[PDB]
Amino acid sequence: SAPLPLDELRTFAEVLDRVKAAYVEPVDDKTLLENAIKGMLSNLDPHSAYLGPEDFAELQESTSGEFGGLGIEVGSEDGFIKVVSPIDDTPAARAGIQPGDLIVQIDGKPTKGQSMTEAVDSMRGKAGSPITLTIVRDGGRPFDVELKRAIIKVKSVKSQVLEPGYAYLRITQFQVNTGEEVVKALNQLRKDNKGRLKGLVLDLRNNPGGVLQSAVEVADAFLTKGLIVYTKGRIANSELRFSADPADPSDKVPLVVLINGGSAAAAEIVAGALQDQKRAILMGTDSFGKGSVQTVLPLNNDRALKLTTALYYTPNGRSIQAQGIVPDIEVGRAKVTQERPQDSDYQLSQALSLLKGLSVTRGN
Amino acid sequence: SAPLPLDELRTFAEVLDRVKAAYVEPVDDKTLLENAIKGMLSNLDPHSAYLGPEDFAELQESTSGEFGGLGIEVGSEDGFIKVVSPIDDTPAARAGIQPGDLIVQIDGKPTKGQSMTEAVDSMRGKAGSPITLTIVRDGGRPFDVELKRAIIKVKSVKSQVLEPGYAYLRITQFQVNTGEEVVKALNQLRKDNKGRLKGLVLDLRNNPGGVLQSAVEVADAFLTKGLIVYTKGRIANSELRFSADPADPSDKVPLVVLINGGSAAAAEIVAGALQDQKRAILMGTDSFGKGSVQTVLPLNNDRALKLTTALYYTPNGRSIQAQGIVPDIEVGRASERPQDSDYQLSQALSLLKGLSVTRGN
Amino acid sequence: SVKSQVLEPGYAYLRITQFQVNTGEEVVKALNQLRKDNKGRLKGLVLDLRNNPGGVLQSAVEVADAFLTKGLIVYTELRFSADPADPSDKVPLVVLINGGSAAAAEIVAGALQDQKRAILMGTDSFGYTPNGRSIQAQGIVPDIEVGRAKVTQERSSFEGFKEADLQGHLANGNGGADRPTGKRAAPSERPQDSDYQLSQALSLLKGLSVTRGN
C-alpha cells in the first residue's frame, strides 16, 4: 500500500496547464508529453536518454553495420566531393568509381552548395531504391551511372602486418559482427605469417563503444579461460556474468592494448578483461572512465527509451566507473627527434618497440 | 469536439513506471516527476526554466553582489551555449571573444545538455577569481581561454566627437538610468557643437541590452512620433505597446545606426524601431535575433516558473524574432582616431558626411 | 659514484659515473636505501652504465658480485667466482650501453649479459666475459639495440572530459573516490621524459614486470 505522489502529480498538472496557457507558440499536449519523457530520461543521468523513431533507427543501424546505401566513404571539401574510399563488396567498385572522383549530381541533385551532413543525408536513402549518379571526370562532360541501393556492412576491424612477425589490429568501433570479424582477421593474420606470429598489438584508441556481447566475444577471442565481465544492477534480469570459452585463436601471442582518452565502456571492457587477466599490457593515456550497460526497451511507435540498467565490473572486482583504467605504461603523444604506420604514429612505434624487446628477451 | 490524447498519457505513465523499475539505483518517483517538469519546460524553449520554491525565494532577494562575473551574455542555441555578446569594458571584452562564439566546455564540464541558467550561474563567481573555458569559434577547434572574473561596472553611454558636426554615441549597456544619461550626453554634444549636429552616428553594437524601458526611453529621445515597439503573446495581458511623445531632444539631427553581430533584444528593438520609422539607416552585421520576453509567474506551492510570455514586434510589423534586423546597407568590420580604428565607423561617418553635404541643410 | 633516483613506485634508476675505490659500499648502501624507499620490493633496476670509462677491476667485480650469485664473472690465469651474497634481491635488470663504456663498465655489462641475469639495451659499447666471447676485440653487442634520441610532448589545447565532469554521473561501484580532471605540474622533467633510450628501458621493464607473472 505504498502511497502515490498525489501532490507531485498535482504540481505536474499545474505546470502543464500553465505552460499550455502562457507559452507564446500554441503547443499541443503531444509535444509537451514527449518533452516530459525526454526530460525524465535525459536528466536522470548523462548517457541515458529518450530515443525518437529516426534516432532509434540510427542507433539500430549503428549497432548493426548493415545500412542502406551504396557503400562509399567520402568527404566534401572546397565545394567538391572527394571519394575517400569505395568500400569493397559494393557496386561502387564495380561501377568504376575511383578515389577523388568528382560526383556532381546524386539522383540528379547537384552536389555543389551542400554541406557535409546535407550531402551525406542526400546520398543516403531507402534500401533497394535505385540511384542514378551524374559524375564529371577530369572536368569533362558528365556521365550517368545507375546503381541499386543495398545493405552495406562497415568493416569495424582493420588488420595489417607492420614488420615480419608483427601484426596490427585496430577496432574502429564495436559492432554485432565484430566477434566473427576479429576471429577471421586473426585466422588470416596467422596464416599470412605461415603459422607463427611474433607479436601482436591491438588498438582501441577513440572507440566510442558498442554492443556488449561483441566486446565480450573479442575478449574471449583473446583469452583462453577466466571470467570476462559481470554486471550488477537492482534488477535481477540485468545481473549477469560473461566468461571466456576454452577456444582461443590467439595461440598465446604477446599482446599490447592501446587505450586513449576516447576509449569508452565497450572498449574499456576488453581493456579490463585483457589487463586483469595478465594477458596484455595496456599503454597510453587514461581511458574515458565510463562504466555502465544500457538496454534499449522496445516501445510503441518504434521509439524506445535506452536506459542505463547496471554497472559492470572488471574481473578482479574494481569498477572503472568515473575513474577508468590507468594504463601500465603511460606513454603520451609526442614527437621524437634523433607505407609504415609506426613511423608516423608515436604510440604505435613505442608499442612495436616494446613488443620487439619482449620477444627478443624471450628469444623465440 | 476532438478526442483526448489518452494513448500518449498511457505511454507516459508506462514509461515512468518502467523507468522506476529498471534503473541502476532506486529512484523515487518524486525525482522522476521533477525531471519530467524540467524537461517539458526546457526542451521546447531553451531560455525558459523551472524555478523551484527555494529558487523563487532566492530570486526574490538575490545575492548582495559581492560575486562579480565575466560580463558575457549567452543565448542557448542548438544545444550549445552561444555567447550572444561580450559586454565591452570587461575581461571578456579585454580577452579575445567575439559574438557567435560557442562556449562548449566551461571549467571542464561539457555544456551540451545543460540549460543556460545554470551555466551562467556557474560562470558567476567570487571577485577576481581565475576561470578557464573552451571556445569553438567560427567552426575552429576548441582552444582554452583563461581569464579572471571580477565585479564589473560599465558606464551605460559614452559620447565623443569625430569631425565638425559629427559625433559618436556608444551605448555600452542599457541601464535603468540610461535614458537620463543619454539625454544629458545628447544635450552636451548639441551645446558643444554650437548648432544642430550634421549627423549623430549611433553605435549600438556588442550591446547585450538591458531593461526594455531604457530602450523605449532612448528611442523616444530620438523619435518624436510613432510607436517604438509592441509585444504580442497568447495571454490577454501579453499585448503591450509603447509610443514616443513629441519631445525631441535629438534636434532633428541626422542619424545612422550601426548593428554588429552582437546586438541583443533591447538594442535590437531600438535599432529596428528607428529603421522602420525611416528616422535613420543601419549598417553592420545582422543582429543576433533574441526578442523573447522571459517572465516569472507563480503556479502554486510558493514556486514559480520562467517562460516566454510574449515576444516583441517593431512598429512596421517585422518580427524581431527569428529574423534579426537586416540593415538597409551592409558593411563588414575590418594614436589612431575612432573614425579610423574600425572600418564600420569610417564607412558610417563618410556616408553621413556625403548625405549631409548632398542635402545642403 | 653511485646515483640512485627512484623513477616510479616499482622501478628505480641507478647510475654509476666512475668506478672509484670501494664503490661496493656506495652501491650496496644505495640498494638498501632504495629498498627502504620502496619498502623492500623492486620491479626492475635500470643500471645506466653510460659515459663511464671504468676504474679498478676489483671494484667492478665487486659490483658484479653484488648483482650476481653464481658463475665466474670475469677471466682474462685469473677467475672471479660468485658467492651467493647479493643485495640485488633477484630484480629484473636492464643495463644500458651508450657506446662510451670503455673498460670496466663494459666488463660488468658483458658479464651480466652472459650470465643472463640482465639485458643490454643501449648502443654497442666503444670497447673477459664468462663465455668464450671477448670484450675489447668485438665490443659488446647489445641484445636489443635502441638508437639514442630525444622526445618532447606537445600541449593539449583541450582536455578530454572524464565521467567525473558530466554532472550527475554515477558513483563508482566500490564507493571509492572519483578522479577529477585536475592539472598538477610534475616535480620536474624526469629522465624517462627526456632521453628516448631510458624511456624505452623503463617501458620494457614495465612490460616484463606485468606480463611475466601475477
Added chain:
Amino acid sequence: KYGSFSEDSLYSLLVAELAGQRNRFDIALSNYVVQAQKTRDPGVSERAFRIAEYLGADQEALDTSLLWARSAPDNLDAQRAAAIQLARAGRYEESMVYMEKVLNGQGDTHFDFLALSAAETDPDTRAGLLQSFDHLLKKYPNNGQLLFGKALLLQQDGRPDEALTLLEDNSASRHEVAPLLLRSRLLQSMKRSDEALPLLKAGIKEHPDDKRVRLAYARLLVEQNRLDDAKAEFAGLVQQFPDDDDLRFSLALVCLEAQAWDEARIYLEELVERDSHVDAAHFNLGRLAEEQKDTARALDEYAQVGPGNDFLPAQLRQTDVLLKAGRVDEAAQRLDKARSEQPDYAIQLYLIEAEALSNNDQQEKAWQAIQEGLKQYPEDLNLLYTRSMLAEKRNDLAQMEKDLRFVIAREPDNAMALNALGYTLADRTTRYGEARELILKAHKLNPDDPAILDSMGWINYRQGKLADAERYLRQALQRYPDHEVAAHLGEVLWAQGRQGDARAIWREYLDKQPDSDVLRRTIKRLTGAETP
C-alpha cells in the same frame, strides 16, 4: 485534431493509471469513470469500460458502457458492449434497441444472450420482450437471430410450433447453426426423432465442419437407440478432430452403451492416461470389466475411482461384486479402511454393507456391521432403519418398534417411518389399533406416497372392513400399481370368501414374474399350500 486536457482531468487520469500499474485498480476505475462521465470522450470512456469489465462491477460497467456508446454512436463495438451490459442489467427492450443500432452497421450480433436472459426474465416482462421482438420482426423480418430469440421465448412459453414452422420456412434459417440446434431441441421437446434425424443430417451436409450439428445428430441417434450409426458418427467426429475432451467422453459413453467393450476400454485407458475426469473413466472401466465378468479388474477399477459423485455408487458396486465373488475378509478390511479414512463416508458405507449383508441372508456379519454403525453413530436415522430391518429379519418386533418409534418422535412430519412401523406392526402384532393409528397419522402427514396407501390397505384388511380397504388399495394403484397393493386386494378377497378372484389376482403377478420372491412369500403366508 486532438482535444485538450483540463488540469484536473490530467491529474485524475495520471493518478488513475499510476494506481492501475500499482494494481490499485479501485482508484483507477473510480477516477476513470468520473472522467469519462465528465469529458464523455470515446477514449476515456472506453478505457474505463475495459477496466470495469476486467474488474466486473455491474453498475460501473453499465454506466461506462452506455456513456461510451453515447460518446461514439458510430462505433459498433461500443454499441454491442452497451447492449450486452444493459441486458445483464435486466433492461432488455433497450438492449434490443441497441442491437438494432448494431444491425444498422452490418456486423456480428449476439442475440442468444438476449434470448437466454429473456428466459431468465419474468413472464410479464417476458411478454413485454415478446411484443418488442414482434415489433422488431415487423421492422426487420430478414434477421434470423431474432427468430431464434422469439423461438426461445415460445419454448419458455411452451408452444414452439409456430416459431419452429416459421424458421423451417426460411431456407437460410434452415441452413444456419443456431436455428438447427434449436430445432433439434424443440423436436426433443415434442419427441419426434423421425424428423430430427433427417433435418440434422441435412444440416451436417450443409456444414459438416461445425461440431454442434454433428453432436446434436449423435444425441438424437442415441435417443433413437440405434448404435451403429451413432458409433460411426462419433468415429468420424473424432477423426475430423480428436481434440475435444467432451467429445471423447461422450464417445466412450456411447461405446459402452453400444456393447463395444474393446474400443470403450481403449478410450477409457487413454482418458485415464490424460488423468482428466478419471473417476468416471475408472467407473466405466469397471463397468466393462463387469461386462467381461472379470472380478479383479471390476473391483480394482472401482477402488481406483477417486472421491466424487460416481465414487460412492462405484464403491457400492464393488461391495456387491466382492460379496458375490467371495473373499469376505479382503473386501471387509478394504471397506473398513476406506471408511475409517472418512467418518462421513464411513457411515454411508457401513450402512451399504449392512444392507447388502441383510439382502444376502446372513446373520452374524450383518448384525456385527449394523451394531458397529449404531455404536459409532447411534443418532443417524438410516442406522435406526437398518436395525429395524435386522430386527424384522430376526423375527422380533420389539427392536424395530422402538427404533421406528424414536425415529417418528425425531421427525414429527415424517411419513415413511410411520408407514413402515404400521405395516411391520400389523404384520407381527395381534392388535391392530396401534398400526391403524400409525398409518392414519402417516396418511394425514403424507397421503400421496404409494407406500402410505399400501400400508393403509393392509391395515384396513386387518381390521375386517372391505369398502375402505378396497378404496385405499385402488388409490394406491392410481398412485402406482404395486404388488403389495394387489397382495392386500387378494387378502381382502380371501377374507370375503372368494378364492377364485384372489387366485387370478396372484396369477397375474406370477405372469408378471415367474419366480418372484415376494409373491411366493405372500402365497405361502396366505394360501398355506404348495399348490395355490
